[PDB]
Amino acid sequence: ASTSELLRCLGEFLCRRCYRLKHLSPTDPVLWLRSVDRSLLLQGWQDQGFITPANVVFLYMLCRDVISSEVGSDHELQAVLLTCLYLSYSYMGNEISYPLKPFLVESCKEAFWDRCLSVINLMSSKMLQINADPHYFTQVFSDLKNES
Amino acid sequence: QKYEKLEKIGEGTYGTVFKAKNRETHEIVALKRVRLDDDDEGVPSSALREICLLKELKHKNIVRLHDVLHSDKKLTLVFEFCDQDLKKYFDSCNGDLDPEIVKSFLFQLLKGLGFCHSRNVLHRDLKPQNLLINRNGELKLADFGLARAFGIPVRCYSAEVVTLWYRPPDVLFGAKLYSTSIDMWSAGCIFAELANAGRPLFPGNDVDDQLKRIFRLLGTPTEEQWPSMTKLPDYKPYPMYPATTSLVNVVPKLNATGRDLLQNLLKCNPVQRISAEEALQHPYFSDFCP
Numbered sequence A: 001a002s003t004s005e006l007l008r009c010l011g012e013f014l015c016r017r018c019y020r021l022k023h024l025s026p027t028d029p030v031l032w033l034r035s036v037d038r039s040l041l042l043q044g045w046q047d048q049g050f051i052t053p054a055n056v057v058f059l060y061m062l063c064r065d066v067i068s069s070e071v072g073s074d075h076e077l078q079a080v081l082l083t084c085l086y087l088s089y090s091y092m093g094n095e096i097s098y099p100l101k102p103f104l105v106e107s108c109k110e111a112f113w114d115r116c117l118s119v120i121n122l123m124s125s126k127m128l129q130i131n132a133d134p135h136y137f138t139q140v141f142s143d144l145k146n147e148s
Numbered sequence B: 001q002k003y004e005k006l007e008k009i010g011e012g013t014y015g016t017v018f019k020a021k022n023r024e025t026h027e028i029v030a031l032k033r034v035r036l037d038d039d040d041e042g043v044p045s046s047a048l049r050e051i052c053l054l055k056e057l058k059h060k061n062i063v064r065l066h067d068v069l070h071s072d073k074k075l076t077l078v079f080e081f082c083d084q085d086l087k088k089y090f091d092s093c094n095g096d097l098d099p100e101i102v103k104s105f106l107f108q109l110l111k112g113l114g115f116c117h118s119r120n121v122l123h124r125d126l127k128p129q130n131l132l133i134n135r136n137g138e139l140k141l142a143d144f145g146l147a148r149a150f151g152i153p154v155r156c157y158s159a160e161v162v163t164l165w166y167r168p169p170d171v172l173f174g175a176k177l178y179s180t181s182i183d184m185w186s187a188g189c190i191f192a193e194l195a196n197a198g199r200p201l202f203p204g205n206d207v208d209d210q211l212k213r214i215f216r217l218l219g220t221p222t223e224e225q226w227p228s229m230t231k232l233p234d235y236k237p238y239p240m241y242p243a244t245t246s247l248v249n250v251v252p253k254l255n256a257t258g259r260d261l262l263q264n265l266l267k268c269n270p271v272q273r274i275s276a277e278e279a280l281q282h283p284y285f286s287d288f289c290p
Ligand SMILES: CN1CCC([C@@](C)(O)c2ccc3cnc(Nc4cc(N5CCOCC5)c(C#N)cc4F)cc3n2)CC1
Pocket: B007, B008, B009, B010, B012, B017, B019, B030, B031, B032, B063, B079, B080, B081, B082, B083, B084, B085, B088, B129, B130, B132, B142, B143, B144
């Protein structure tokens, strides 16, 4: 039930999923996520940090159905994980509206907004169901813990 | 590009709204344009949430998102077109509605809201501007920019939700957590506008002034009515106002049945507030009412 331990699991999951990434550390995801959360706090977009156990579980749900095994670079993985994160902020965030500079790691901004609309068309039903159905939250919560 | 703009409907801070025509199938729709390179960022976040929720909220009393388009550093939501909102409709009809219309509008509002709650969604921004009306007399709730899914355990939601005039007393006292009851208060406030001159029941200047106008009419809750109240984060002593103050002059279009429903929506203690489902089974919506 610890945030850092659940972040670690997600990072270990992402490493397992993306076999092609030979020089990816399970700390790189954790670093990227904590960098965004810190950046928004110290710029005054939020009072508290977003990354809590339930939100990391929410993020994992998105990640496991969006992040393809065939991710061809660590850079492309960051671009996707952060697209999944941005949507977690937008859907579960307390503050009404979050910027996209901290989340954007591609030159081509058009490419990012296209990924958002894909991830939404795919997950919007599950994004609501994980809230609506407590059994499904627990299933995802367990699955995340079983990724270390 | 695929659509032909006719006239602007509204100019929000979250986007620009146009009345438009599908060039292919010649149908009239509403268009919300959202710019996607703002030095003062953030606006898109609201649009993405609104989309994610409306994709899973399909109902005749909830505005329909048909499609979303991404072009030329702009995002475009495509809603069904509605003839006006309730705010413009009051100014149009002198603030005066036939009692049978008040029933129609509230019934449809509760059906839409009932669906939202059952699908585990809080609206959190009820107000006439966000109630869309068509000439045929249909009502549809809109604007899910501040709406939210609920069920996952959290530390707290936001207390900075709902326009001050439709915010329930628990949230005005800074309540960390709130259920579906948040929307049922706003719905009560809206009912009172339909039932009089279309004027806000509780039009306060700030939080303090708001809470004084709610207690002045309904009465300051006792420890018995609402034991949780004094434990709330931004609680402070308010005068005991009597529960003897009559609503007859406040909602003069409603008879006893109507006035009863209004009081079950406007329970200060959130746990006591009637639910959308319960309210649709109230005698006020029976086919047996004078
Ligand atoms: C505050 N909030 C802002 C966002 C808005 C939005 C984008 O979510 C949205 C959705 C769906 C919509 C469907 N229909 C409309 N038609 C309207 C048409 C009007 N016309 C009157 C005749 O003359 C031309 C203008 C007038 C007025 N006055 C209001 C209208 F609501 C607007 C919609 N807006 C919701 C409200």
